[PDB]
Design an enzyme around this catalytic site. Sequence first.
Site, PDB file in Angstrom:
ATOM      1  N   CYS A 105      -3.205   3.788  -3.983  1.00 20.02           N
ATOM      2  CA  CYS A 105      -3.750   2.105  -4.178  1.00 20.02           C
ATOM      3  C   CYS A 105      -2.013   0.732  -2.889  1.00 20.02           C
ATOM      4  O   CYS A 105      -1.913   1.210  -2.451  1.00 20.02           O
ATOM      5  CB  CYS A 105      -3.992   0.730  -5.435  1.00 20.02           C
ATOM      6  SG  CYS A 105      -4.189  -0.673  -5.146  1.00 20.02           S
ATOM      7  N   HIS A 125      -4.160   1.275  -0.568  1.00 15.94           N
ATOM      8  CA  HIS A 125      -5.489   0.142  -0.437  1.00 15.94           C
ATOM      9  C   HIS A 125      -6.108  -0.079   1.289  1.00 15.94           C
ATOM     10  O   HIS A 125      -4.522  -0.455   1.594  1.00 15.94           O
ATOM     11  CB  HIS A 125      -5.396  -0.846  -1.687  1.00 15.94           C
ATOM     12  CG  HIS A 125      -6.612  -1.795  -1.664  1.00 15.94           C
ATOM     13  ND1 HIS A 125      -6.773  -3.129  -0.980  1.00 15.94           N
ATOM     14  CD2 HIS A 125      -7.259  -1.420  -2.802  1.00 15.94           C
ATOM     15  CE1 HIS A 125      -8.156  -3.420  -1.636  1.00 15.94           C
ATOM     16  NE2 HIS A 125      -8.439  -2.569  -2.663  1.00 15.94           N
TER      17      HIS A 125
END
EC number: 3.1.2.-
Lengths: 186, 186
Positions: A105, A125
Amino acid sequence: ASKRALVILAKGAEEMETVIPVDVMRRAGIKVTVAGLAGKDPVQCSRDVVICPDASLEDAKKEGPYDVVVLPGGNLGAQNLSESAAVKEILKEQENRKGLIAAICAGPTALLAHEIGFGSKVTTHPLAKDKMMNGGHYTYSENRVEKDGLILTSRGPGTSFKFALAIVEALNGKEVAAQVKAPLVL
Amino acid sequence: ASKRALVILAKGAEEMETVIPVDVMRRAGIKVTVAGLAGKDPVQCSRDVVICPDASLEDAKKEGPYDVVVLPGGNLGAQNLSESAAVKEILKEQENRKGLIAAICAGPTALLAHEIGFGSKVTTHPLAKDKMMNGGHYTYSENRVEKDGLILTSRGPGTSFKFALAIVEALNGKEVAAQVKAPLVL
């Protein structure tokens, strides 16, 4: 012998990206240490789940080396990892001994901060891409999990199972990963 | 006004099935109380993640009612929920006021223990089916999420996102669920 994982837990970590890897790796028979960046105190995650680490990072670092170092995401957690000299030392050591580093992420932006794995293919992400790519030190991927040698990256809460199982596969093999996966109902 | 969720956390709970709903519901703007069955002390989950509850169940029950009561799975966590008189009272109250009850994996077997929602279509983890179905008081489903009126059930760690988003949809609607889902990278 069992493989060992260090999961570095900082304030603001994404709690799903912390717990899913810890749980799946323990299902795989990996010995996991959840290490608190700031000490053994409870850690308030990004959505206010409070997790009690197994050890301080200070102590856990004295007990390695580890077969994988795992960096959860969460924008604020990743910033705390990025600012830590202890994290820098752990990651450099791990890179130098050719050990796996796994980050999800915003977590991979701590690799950038600590100059780890430059020239690797990575994902993050979507909202962390521009931060990760500042300076062009990595090549970006939109795959849900990306692995380029010892740098293993993934995108978000919803890729955490795939990320965790990729760690399991890297450490314990395809068969163990498949055995662990079935009872998850994925 | 915001909707409110009670998540009942017992020793042996599946930590992924606890954290994924809590986190996703907080992303949806639901006010979530993580209530410790045995008090406010830390809870050792099934894969040894230790979570600090927000409140004891004793205190949280005095502060309802709640728009959803959520029962995580984990075989030992579900057994603890099934044995608790406080859980029985909370679930009966919730059923009587026509409030949502959401249970995942082995969690629905606490519904059976407390005689909640008989005649409903339900799913469970595959390994919990026979326990759930003892006496034929429910009709079984293999769908990843099943909702029959106010009884919402799901199957395992790997269905936890779908389960959590189904709670969000029930409480806050389809649009909020879709907005919450996108940044998860599902």
